[PDB]
């Protein structure tokens, strides 16, 4: 992982007693070229980079729109029509998506039923219980879907 | 799981009627008491990091670090400069406009710029080894004479 706050801070220091300037280079899709991979005097793997917990409701959020999307919006319920609920622990999100994410959800068209509901997160500090901590989780999370079928995502 | 897969699902739970609760637990997991209710359980192994966004969070970890170090009050010194250079596949526009904000607030003092390189364009007939040739002449055009690591 060589993208670990510890890891790459080291990593910076030893570039920095060299001297030289350094560029990361990241291609498209498919790869880089020849010529970059000739000139990398170091390589990191990106099967080492894994996604950030904060982005899974992001992208669970985006792959529900996307479905919904393509789908024939078929049945009719007397009662009413099936609603979603993501419920999530809301772990804090990175600087770059906040005030972004939530006008993505604001704009999810008014026929797709679906809200965003975040339970907070427990403190993940070192005199704070972790087995607690994700019993109470749990205890939100239930509470906020009530008697609707539950999926888990895990 | 694929597009399909999942709107198929939709479509049965629309049909049923009874409101869905999808539930994510914290980096931990879920608790017990969860996984007993659930009466499906789907892995997030299967959700991977879209293309747009590693340029994204590599500018991240490398403002962690630089911010973790100079912070440090015995840090080693040096003039070295970091670049990212990176093919500027085209992101969400909501996230977008998130990245451009998050740079503008880095630090002067944070010796870091990003680069990005034009796409070349993909599609049905798109010439792949033409494409990934030309981003890496301007990708190595940007860089100079700079060490290189690559990420891939």
Redesign the interface.
Known sequence: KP?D?PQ??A???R???????????????????????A????????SA?????P???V??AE??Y???S??????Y?R???????????G?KM????????T??LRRFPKDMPFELIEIP??KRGKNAD?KR???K???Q??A???K???????
């Open positions: 993208w706050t790459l801070a990593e910076l220091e570039w920095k007693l060299d001297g030289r300037d350094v560029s990361l280079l990241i291609g498209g899709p498919e790869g880089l070229s020849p010529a970059c991979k000139a990398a005097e170091q390589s990191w793997s990106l980079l894994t996604l950030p917990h982005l899974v409701r992208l669970v792959s529900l996307r479905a919904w393509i789908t024939t919006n078929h049945p319920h009662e009413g029509s099936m609603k979603l609920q993501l419920v999530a622990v772990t990175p600087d770059w998506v906040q005030t972004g994410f006008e993505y997160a427990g972790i901590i994700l019993d989780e749990g205890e999370m239930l906020a879907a009530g609707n079928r539950i999926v888990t995502l895990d």
